Amino acid sequence: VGSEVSDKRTCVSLTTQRLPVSRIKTYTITEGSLRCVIFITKRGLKVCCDPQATWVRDVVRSMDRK
Amino acid sequence: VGSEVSDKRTCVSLTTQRLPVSRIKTYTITEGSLRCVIFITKRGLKVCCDPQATWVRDVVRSMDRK
Numbered sequence: 001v002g003s004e005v006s007d008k009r010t011c012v013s014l015t016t017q018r019l020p021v022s023r024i025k026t027y028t029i030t031e032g033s034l035r036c037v038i039f040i041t042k043r044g045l046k047v048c049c050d051p052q053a054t055w056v057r058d059v060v061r062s063m064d065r066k
Numbered sequence: 067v068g069s070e071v072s073d074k075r076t077c078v079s080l081t082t083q084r085l086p087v088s089r090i091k092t093y094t095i096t097e098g099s100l101r102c103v104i105f106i107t108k109r110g111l112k113v114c115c116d117p118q119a120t121w122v123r124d125v126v127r128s129m130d131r132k
Binding site: 010012014015016017019020021022023025027029031032034036038040044045047049051 | 076078079080082083085086087088089091093095097098100102104106111113115117
């Protein structure tokens with residue numbers, strides 16, 4: 001959520017229950033080059049599948065040899 | 067049988083994306099005393115959390131090898 005609503009990621013957040021969870025944990029699903037992140041919260045869950053969509057050449061990484 | 071039906075599989079579902087998935091799979095979360103079942107589909111995601119209440123006898127799912 002922010003002061004802009006255009007392109008975040010394709011994530012959906014569904015609110016269910018109000019029962020406490022052990023910890024707000026995130027699960028990553030990786031199937032067929034598809035990532036999915038699940039946020040378990042005490043008021044709902046966020047599930048966000050990403051087919052490496054945001055994976056562009058940003059920043060440009062280069063590992064220092066050693 | 068009729069219009070009386072407040073009982074349903076209490077799962078929250080949203081349809082997002084349209085990319086084919088490797089397998090419509092389910093991940094079952096068990097954190098604390100909370101169970102959750104996540105359906106990955108090629109056009110949506112179903113997250114069904116169960117704090118151990120939706121225990122009905124049907125479906126009969128042999129655990130698809132995660």
